[PDB]
Design a protein around this ligand. Structure first.
Ligand code: FES
Ligand SMILES: [K+]
Ligand SMILES: [K+]
Ligand SMILES: [K+]
Ligand SMILES: [K+]
Ligand SMILES: [K+]
Ligand SMILES: [Mg+2]
Ligand SMILES: [Mg+2]
Ligand SMILES: [Mg+2]
Ligand SMILES: [Mg+2]
Ligand SMILES: [Mg+2]
Ligand SMILES: [Mg+2]
Ligand SMILES: [Mg+2]
Ligand SMILES: [Mg+2]
Ligand SMILES: [Mg+2]
Ligand SMILES: [Mg+2]
Ligand SMILES: [Mg+2]
Ligand SMILES: [Mg+2]
Ligand SMILES: [Mg+2]
Ligand SMILES: [Mg+2]
Ligand SMILES: [Mg+2]
Ligand SMILES: [Mg+2]
Ligand SMILES: [Mg+2]
Ligand SMILES: [Mg+2]
Ligand SMILES: [Mg+2]
Ligand SMILES: [Mg+2]
Ligand SMILES: [Mg+2]
Ligand SMILES: [Mg+2]
Ligand SMILES: [Mg+2]
Ligand SMILES: [Mg+2]
Ligand SMILES: [Mg+2]
Ligand SMILES: [Mg+2]
Lengths: 164, 108, 45
RNA sequence: ACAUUUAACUAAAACCCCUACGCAUUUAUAUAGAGGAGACAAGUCGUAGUAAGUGUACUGGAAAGUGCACUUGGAC
RNA sequence: AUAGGUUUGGUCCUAGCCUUUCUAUUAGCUCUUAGUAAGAUUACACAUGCAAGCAUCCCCGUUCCAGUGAGUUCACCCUCUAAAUCACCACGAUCAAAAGGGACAAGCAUCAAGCACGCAGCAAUGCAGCUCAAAACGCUUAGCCUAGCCACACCCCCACGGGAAACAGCAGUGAUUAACCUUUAGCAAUAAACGAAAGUUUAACUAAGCUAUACUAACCCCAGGGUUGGUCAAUUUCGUGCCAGCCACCGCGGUCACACGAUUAACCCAAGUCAAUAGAAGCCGGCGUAAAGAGUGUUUUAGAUCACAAUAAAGCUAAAACUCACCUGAGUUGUAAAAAACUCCAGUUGACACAAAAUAGACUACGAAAGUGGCUUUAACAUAUCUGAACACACAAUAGCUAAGACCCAAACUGGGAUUAGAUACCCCACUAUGCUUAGCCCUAAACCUCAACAGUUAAAUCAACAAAACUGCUCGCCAGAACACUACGAGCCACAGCUUAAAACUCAAA
């Protein structure tokens, strides 16, 4: 079987289940947590289960972790403007931390839908080209248009050999 | 191995495949230097028709002549393909019948 | 006979070491070795 | 190493240097000679006590043996 | 992989090799028509003809298109900002160099150190730094991430200069390779250049020529190639007789050969077939006995969640030896039986170690391991997370080597005694190195509980086998068929035919 505890964490489906897409302001995220102590328990799970998803959805955001440097667990976000956002996570569950960070620094669903609609415009359906970019290669694939000579030989009258 | 060790070592690195007597080519042209016969290794017994040839690469190699009856002499041009002769140790090349000087096996 | 071969190999190793050391100061621009420098014989007791 | 001239009632002309590479350095090929690995060759070839080991060290009456330590993957 | 064949007398396990599938090139044999796509092996040398003009002179273009894959992290993103197009009064958009920041192929660590590779200051100058086992530096391989991009344009990276006289433009040729397209037409379309424009030019391109390389469709007559022991669909008769020959693996052939050759029949695919070659598809599995836990411990950068018989010193000695002395005796030793040897021999008694430590111990302790078992005393047995190294730092039985010393006993070697018919290597006697102490080396063991360290469980189907009940979490180390090979080369070491690390070629179908 897959090595380690909770191997589901190392699947692309789980990594893509993350729901936090940070705004463009967030550059760095430091996660200070304690290996022991019940009060930081949720924070530990946040490191165990949710940091991979956050990083997968935010590849260009620096995420760095620190252990047993302060009595309490906390998150700090550094923004492009120089503003710093501190989120105390002691006594919180990892779901609460995820929801809080999504609320305060995550792109809302409307902005994500707008981005998806903007993406859709790039792949214009009417454009003809390679399958890698277009639905169809050539107009010959459209029903009712003159078909490709590979499949249907063209009548003798429209071919240059018998027009010359 | 642990996940850290697998990450450190990285993906398996398959050794490069070994080039055979033909040096990864379908066939090779050769000039016959001398003809002789060799005896099989034993589960068997025979007098296998073989010939030494200088290949186009310049190396000299022993090749097997298949079929009943051949008319190969010195200085003749042959085409040799791959495929080991299982009975003859060290003979990994076979002459192509019906190409250049080596003619097809005569009927009956 | 392995003594002769081995000592010849040790001599060649010393020569290679000296050649590399010379390469360095030649590339650095110094026409000669560093003032007072003498390559030690490290491969012979 | 090497150098600011002419010209100027509209404005222009003129411009140009000499030195390296070797008995240095890298790798490769060829050649004298020496040495290993595999191939238990094919037959109209031939035949009716000292337990095991691992390290070392020695052997000039060596068809194998001995000294020291250790192991049971022996016996009692 | 829905797997299959093959190790053995047999079973199970492990493990390699091969089969079945899909493409590409070449070869054999065989090939009818039509449409489409694709089309030197070679950055080797090239005969010949064309491939760049336009235009009232200036300019503009010929820096493009077309070609090749030699070299090879120049291609991508961001910042800044030229040239170019359009605004063309610029405001600025588009496009895109140079420069700055980041990203960016494969194999080899037996390429492990690079050798000036950094910083600060206006400068003078000062500091000594910078990269690197999370792979620097180095060697080798390859065009790439394909609406396309990068690099090159005969060579000297470059091209002032030199070699020297250039098809990697189209057609074509020579040589070379297994590899082999016409020395056609037209600018009618699109694109490019030029022109104010009608237009002109273009081996780009368009339309044709050749070729089973491929796709699609067809055919009145027209089917070939391979295969038929198993894997794997399918053999009648003869011929041959371990020969001739055949096989991808296992294998067949010695007078009944479904395995060779011919013939008959059958099977698969089919204008193809399938012989060779090359790709397509690889470790989330293991390490007591199959390859793999490398003798012991510590820690670094990090990762994880488990937060009384030790050893060094000093002293000391109860038995038994050796040596010396008196008294006594003529023999003592030696063994299956003897001979040599000793008779400065032997017995009692007394004195007397730099050697070794009965009994306790039927105990199972101490120490990281190696090891440690006579008595006394002095020092003394790390760490309040865990893991953490062939190489760093400290240790490692026995054997072996330098200097000095001690020598009872034992004892490799060396002599002698005794022995068959080439004796006993083996028994007996004598005596070395060595076993001991001091100061240094060497660094090997069946260094083994043949069980890596920590933490946890006993519920599950307990569980290939045997060994030692079966497992889980986490970390480090190690392993990917056999042999070559506890090897060669490289490197390191107080080691000098020594130790550690450790391959490749040829070979095999197993081990
Ligand atoms: S691809 Fe459209 S006519 Fe062929
Ligand atoms: K013009
Ligand atoms: K290339
Ligand atoms: K060049
Ligand atoms: K035209
Ligand atoms: K043991
Ligand atoms: Mg032991
Ligand atoms: Mg198998
Ligand atoms: Mg068998
Ligand atoms: Mg063919
Ligand atoms: Mg500009
Ligand atoms: Mg640039
Ligand atoms: Mg090497
Ligand atoms: Mg390493
Ligand atoms: Mg290349
Ligand atoms: Mg050039
Ligand atoms: Mg040409
Ligand atoms: Mg040329
Ligand atoms: Mg071809
Ligand atoms: Mg023309
Ligand atoms: Mg054509
Ligand atoms: Mg047959
Ligand atoms: Mg083993
Ligand atoms: Mg062990
Ligand atoms: Mg530790
Ligand atoms: Mg290591
Ligand atoms: Mg030792
Ligand atoms: Mg000693
Ligand atoms: Mg002695
Ligand atoms: Mg360990
Ligand atoms: Mg092997
Ligand atoms: Mg060695």
């Amino acid at each position: 079987p897959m090595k380690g505890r909770f191997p589901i964490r190392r699947t692309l489906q789980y990594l893509s289940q993350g729901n936090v897409v940070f705004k463009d302001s967030v550059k760095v995220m430091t996660v200070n947590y304690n290996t022991h102590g019940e009060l930081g328990e949720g924070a530990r799970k946040f490191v165990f289960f949710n940091i991979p998803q956050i990083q997968y959805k935010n590849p260009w955001v620096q995420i760095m972790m620190f252990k047993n440097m302060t009595p309490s667990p906390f998150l700090r976000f550094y923004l492009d403007s120089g503003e710093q956002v501190l989120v105390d996570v002691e006594t919180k569950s990892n779901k609460e931390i995820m929801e809080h960070i999504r609320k305060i620094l995550g792109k809302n669903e409307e902005t994500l839908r707008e981005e998806e609609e903007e993406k859709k415009q790039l792949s214009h359906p009417a454009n003809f080209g390679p399958r890698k970019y277009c639905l169809r290669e050539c107009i010959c694939e459209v029903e009712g248009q003159v078909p490709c000579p590979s499949l249907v030989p063209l009548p003798k009258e429209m071919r240059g050999k018998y027009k010359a | 191995a642990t996940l850290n060790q697998m990450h450190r070592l990285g993906p398996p690195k398959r050794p490069p495949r070994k080039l055979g007597p033909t040096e990864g080519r379908p066939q090779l042209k050769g000039v016959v230097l001398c003809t002789f016969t060799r005896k099989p290794k034993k589960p068997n017994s025979a007098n296998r028709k073989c010939c030494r040839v200088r290949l186009s690469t310049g190396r000299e190699a022993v090749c097997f002549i298949p079929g009943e009856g051949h008319t190969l002499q010195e200085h003749q041009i042959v085409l040799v393909e791959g495929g080991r002769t299982q009975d003859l140790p060290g003979v990994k090349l076979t002459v192509v019948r019906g190409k250049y000087d080596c003619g097809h096996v005569q009927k009956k | 006979l392995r003594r002769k071969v081995q000592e010849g190999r040790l001599r060649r190793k010393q020569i290679k070491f000296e050649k590399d050391l010379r390469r360095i100061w030649l590339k650095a621009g110094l026409k000669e070795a560093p003032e007072g420098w003498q390559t030690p014989k490290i491969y012979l007791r």
